[PDB]
Symmetry: D3
Subunit: 144 residues, 6 copies
Amino acid sequence: TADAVLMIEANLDDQTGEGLGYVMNQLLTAGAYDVFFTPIQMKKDRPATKLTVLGNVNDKDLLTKLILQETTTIGVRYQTWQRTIMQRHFLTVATPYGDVQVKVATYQDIEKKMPEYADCAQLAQQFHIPFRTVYQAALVAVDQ
Amino acid sequence: TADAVLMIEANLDDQTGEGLGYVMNQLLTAGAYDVFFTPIQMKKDRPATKLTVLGNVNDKDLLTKLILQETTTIGVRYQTWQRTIMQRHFLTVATPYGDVQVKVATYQDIEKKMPEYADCAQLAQQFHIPFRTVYQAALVAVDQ
Amino acid sequence: DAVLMIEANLDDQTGEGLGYVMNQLLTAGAYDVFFTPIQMKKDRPATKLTVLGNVNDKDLLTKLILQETTTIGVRYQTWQRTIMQRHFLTVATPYGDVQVKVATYQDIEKKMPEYADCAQLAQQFHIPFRTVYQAALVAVDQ
Amino acid sequence: DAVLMIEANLDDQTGEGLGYVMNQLLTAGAYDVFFTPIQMKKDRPATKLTVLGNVNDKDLLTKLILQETTTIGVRYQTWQRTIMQRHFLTVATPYGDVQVKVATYQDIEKKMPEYADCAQLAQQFHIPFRTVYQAALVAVDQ
Amino acid sequence: DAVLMIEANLDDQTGEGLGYVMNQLLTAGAYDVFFTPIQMKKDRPATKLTVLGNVNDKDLLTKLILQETTTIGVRYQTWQRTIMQRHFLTVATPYGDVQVKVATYQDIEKKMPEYADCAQLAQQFHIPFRTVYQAALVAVDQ
Amino acid sequence: TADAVLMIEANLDDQTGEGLGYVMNQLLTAGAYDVFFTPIQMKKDRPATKLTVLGNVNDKDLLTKLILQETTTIGVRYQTWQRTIMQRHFLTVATPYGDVQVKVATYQDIEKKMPEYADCAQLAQQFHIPFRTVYQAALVAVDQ
Ligand SMILES: Nc1ccn([C@@H]2O[C@H](COP(=O)(O)OP(=O)(O)OP(=O)(O)O)[C@@H](O)[C@H]2O)c(=O)n1
Ligand SMILES: Nc1ccn([C@@H]2O[C@H](COP(=O)(O)OP(=O)(O)OP(=O)(O)O)[C@@H](O)[C@H]2O)c(=O)n1
Ligand SMILES: Nc1ccn([C@@H]2O[C@H](COP(=O)(O)OP(=O)(O)OP(=O)(O)O)[C@@H](O)[C@H]2O)c(=O)n1
Ligand SMILES: Nc1ccn([C@@H]2O[C@H](COP(=O)(O)OP(=O)(O)OP(=O)(O)O)[C@@H](O)[C@H]2O)c(=O)n1
Ligand SMILES: Nc1ccn([C@@H]2O[C@H](COP(=O)(O)OP(=O)(O)OP(=O)(O)O)[C@@H](O)[C@H]2O)c(=O)n1
Ligand SMILES: Nc1ccn([C@@H]2O[C@H](COP(=O)(O)OP(=O)(O)OP(=O)(O)O)[C@@H](O)[C@H]2O)c(=O)n1
Ligand SMILES: [Cl-]
Ligand SMILES: [Cl-]
Ligand SMILES: [Cl-]
Ligand SMILES: [Cl-]
Ligand SMILES: [Cl-]
Ligand SMILES: [Cl-]
Ligand SMILES: [Cl-]
Ligand SMILES: [Mn+2]
Ligand SMILES: [Mn+2]
Ligand SMILES: [Mn+2]
Ligand SMILES: [Mn+2]
Ligand SMILES: [Mn+2]
Ligand SMILES: [Mn+2]
Ligand SMILES: [Mn+2]
Ligand SMILES: [Mn+2]
Ligand SMILES: [Mn+2]
Ligand SMILES: [Mn+2]
Ligand SMILES: [Mn+2]
Ligand SMILES: [Mn+2]
Ligand SMILES: [Mn+2]
Ligand SMILES: [Mn+2]
Ligand SMILES: [Mn+2]
Ligand SMILES: [Mn+2]
Ligand SMILES: [Mn+2]
Ligand SMILES: [Mn+2]
C-alpha cells in the first residue's frame, strides 16, 4: 500500500522536440514508472521543456545515466517521494465487442475499475467504432 | 514565520476536464491551502494534467483519500516542503467606492498590502466599473 | 453557423483580473472564453485570451475586453463551422434523473451526460462525480 | 499551396481518447495534428485540438473529429502558405546512410537530418540520437 | 488597422535557437512575437511561433522565419482589428518622471504606467518594481 | 560530481507578466543557478504562473527575501534536491567564422560538447548568417 518513488528532473532549452520524443521512449523501455514533459519558460526568452521521470528508488543510477547520455543536460536533480497506492488486479470483462481487461483498484473502501486502453483501442480500430463508444461499453459491462 | 507544507501530486491522462474542475472545488472546500493544475505531456501522445495540492502536513490522509475517491488515479505521491511565510493581518480601507479589505503582510522590513479580490470585484460589478479601476483605487487609498 | 473569434495577448494584467473578465464575458453571452499560456518578449509569461461568439456580438464583446483588460487593441475574424444535430434525453438513475446530450452526425450518435446534473446529484448524494456519470451511461444503455 | 485548419476545444474527453484521435487523424492523411493546453470555464483544464490538412479533405477530417471526440461542432478556415523548395540528400556515415532534407528559399539553404533515419540507426548501433544526427552533419560538410 | 499573423510549428529546433529568432524578428519590426507550447506527433513537445506584424512586411517576416527556423513553410492570414485611441502622460513621482499610457475607448479610460520607466527607476533607486508602479498610479490620481 | 541544490517555488495569480520578467532577471543577477516559469491554472478561473528558482542550499535567505520583496507572494516553499552533475571544462574551437567556446562535459564514460550560445549568436549577427548555421559549424568543428 505504502512505498516510495524517485523523481528525477532536468530542464532542456538546448534540445529538439524530436530528441525529446526519442528519450521519452528510451526511458519507458528502461522501466520508468512514468515519464512526462512540462512546458516551461527559461532565461533569454527560450521556450523549454522540463523532463520528469518517476521510477524505483534503486534505479537512480540507471535513469540518471540514461538521461545524461541521451539528453543535452549537464546535471540532473532527483528526490524521493512517499506514495499511497491502491491495490490493483485485473478482471476479464465481456463486452458487446469482445473481452476487455479492466484494472480493479481498491483502497480501504474506495474502489474504481478502469478499462485497459489498448484493449479498447484495438477493438475500436478493428470494428470501426469510436474509441469512446467501446470504452463506455466496457464501463457499462463493468457495472455488471 | 516558519512552518512546513505537504505537497501531493497526481498525473491524470484518463480523466475529463469536467471531472477535474469538480475535484478542484471539492479539494478547496476540504481545506487545502491551494490547488492547481499543470498541463503536462504523457506517453502515447496523451495531453494530460498534473494535479498539485498544498495543505497541512497532518491532512495527508484526508487529501489523499479525497483524491483517490474523486479522481481516476491509482496512486498519489506526496512530500513535505519547508516554508517561509510573512506575517499577515487585515486593514479596512475606505475607497471612492466603499470599504475594501486589504491584507497587510510583513516579513522583517519587507511589507506589502494586497486588496481583497472579492471586495473589489463585488464593487466593480455593483457600480459597473472595471475591476482594475477599483483595485487601483484601493491601491491608491492604501498608500494613505 | 459562423462564429466570431476575438484574441488579445496580455502580459500586463494579473490572473485575478483575468478570472474576472472571463466571467463578465460569459454573462455577456459569449459562446466560449478560454486562456492559452504564451511566452512574450522580455521574458514575460503571458496569457492569450480567446473569445468565441455570435458575429453580431462583435461590438459588445470588443467593448468588454477593451474596458476590462489592459490590451490596447483586439484582433478578430470569422470562422465557418460544422455543427452536429443535438437533442437531449432524460434518464432515470438511482440518484435521480440526469439529462444526456445526444449528438448525431450522419451515422454518428454519441452521448455526453450533462455536467450540471451529475455534479449536482454527486454533491447531493455524497458520491463521486464519476459514479453518477457512469450510472447515466448504464441508464442510457436501456 | 493553401492549408485547412480545423479547431475544437475539449474539456469533456480523457487524454487517452485524445491520443487515439491524433493517430486516427494522421492515418487519415492530415498534414499535422497538435494539442494546445487551454483553460476553460468552471476551472476546467482543457485541450484545444488543431488539425492541418488539404482543403479538399475538409469533410473527412471533420467527420473523424465529430465521430471520435466529444465536440458538438468544429470551426475551420483556410490559411495561405509560403513553402520552401525541398529536396533530399543521402549521406554516408559510420552507421549507414542517412537521408537529409535540404530546404532552400531564395539564397537560403538549410539541412535537417531525417528523424526516422537517425533514430533507427541510433537504436541499431546503440548510440545516442544526437551522435547519429551530428555524424550526418559532418557527412554533409563534405 | 489590420494585422498579419504568421504561424509555424517547430518540433526540430532548440529553445536557444528560438530565443534568437524572437529577437531577430522584433528588431525587424514585427509588432509582436510569442511562443505557444504545443504537443505534436511521436511524443514531441513542441513550440508554435506566432508573429504579428504589418501586412506589408509579409515577405520580410516570412524570409526571416524560413532562414532562422527549421520550418519548411509558414501559414499566414490577416485579422481585422479594433484599436483604442492612445496618448501618454508624464507624472512626477519621488523617483522621477514616469510616462503613463492612457488608452480611451468610447467612455473607457485606463492607465498603464510604462514598463521601461518603472523598471529603470526601480533599479536606479533600489526599490521593488511594484513600488514605482504604484507611485505612478498615485501621481496619476492627482 | 555529487552535490545538492535548493529549489524554491511560489504561485502567482496576482502579479503581471511585466513584473515577472523583471524578477526573473533580478534573480539571475543574484546568482541563481536557474529560474523558470511554469504556466499553471489556479482557483476562480485564474491563469497563473509558478516561479521556480534553483540555487545554492546556503542561498535560502537571499533568494527567499528577494522573492518576497519583488513578487506579490505571501510565502515561499523550498526544499533540497540531490544532484548528479557532469564534470565540465571549456575548449576554444576554431570554426569557419571565428573561435567559439565549447563546454566539454564528462561523466564516467559519457561525454558531450556544447557550443556556447552567446558566441554563436554574436557571430551569426555579425556575419548575417543563421544562428543554426553557425551552431552546426561549431558542432562539426568540435568533431575535430
Ligand atoms: N507513475 C506511475 C504510473 C504507473 N504506475 C504503475 O505502472 C502501471 C502502468 O500504468 P499504466 O498507465 O496503466 O501503464 P500502461 O498499461 O502500460 O499504459 P496505459 O496508460 O495505456 O494503460 C500501472 O499499473 C501503475 O500501477 C506506477 O507505479 N507509477
Ligand atoms: N499556498 C497557499 C496559499 C494560501 N495560503 C494562505 O491561505 C489564504 C488563502 O489565500 P488567498 O489566495 O488570499 O485565498 P482567498 O482569500 O480565499 O482567495 P483570493 O485569492 O481571491 O484572495 C492566504 O491568506 C494565505 O495566507 C497558504 O497558506 N498557502
Ligand atoms: N464553442 C462553442 C461553445 C458553446 N456554444 C453554444 O453554447 C452552449 C453552451 O455551451 P456549453 O459549454 O455546453 O455550456 P453549458 O452546458 O452551460 O456548460 P457545461 O459544459 O457544464 O455543460 C452550447 O450548447 C452551444 O450551443 C457554441 O455554439 N460554440
Ligand atoms: N504543417 C504541415 C506539416 C506537414 N506537411 C507535409 O507533410 C509531410 C510530412 O511532414 P513531417 O512532419 O516531416 O512527416 P514525417 O517526415 O513523417 O515526420 P518526421 O518529423 O519524423 O520527419 C511534409 O513533408 C509536408 O509535405 C505540410 O504540408 N504541412
Ligand atoms: N499586437 C501588437 C503589439 C504591438 N503593437 C504596436 O507596437 C507598439 C509596441 O508595443 P509594446 O508591446 O507596448 O512595445 P514596448 O512599449 O516597447 O514594450 P513594453 O511592453 O515594455 O512597454 C505598440 O505601441 C503598438 O503600437 C501593435 O500594433 N500590435
Ligand atoms: N540549473 C542549473 C543550470 C546551470 N548550472 C550551471 O551554471 C552554468 C550556467 O548554465 P548555462 O545554461 O550554460 O548558463 P549561461 O552560459 O549563462 O547561459 P547559456 O544557456 O546561454 O549558455 C552551467 O555551466 C551549469 O553548469 C547549474 O549548476 N544549475
Ligand atoms: Cl538541476
Ligand atoms: Cl506517482
Ligand atoms: Cl493584435
Ligand atoms: Cl491559436
Ligand atoms: Cl467553435
Ligand atoms: Cl502550415
Ligand atoms: Cl506555498
Ligand atoms: Mn544553457
Ligand atoms: Mn473470453
Ligand atoms: Mn494500463
Ligand atoms: Mn495509464
Ligand atoms: Mn466603514
Ligand atoms: Mn484573499
Ligand atoms: Mn507591452
Ligand atoms: Mn451543457
Ligand atoms: Mn448533504
Ligand atoms: Mn460544455
Ligand atoms: Mn520527414
Ligand atoms: Mn541491438
Ligand atoms: Mn517533421
Ligand atoms: Mn510601451
Ligand atoms: Mn545603484
Ligand atoms: Mn490569492
Ligand atoms: Mn584564436
Ligand atoms: Mn553557457
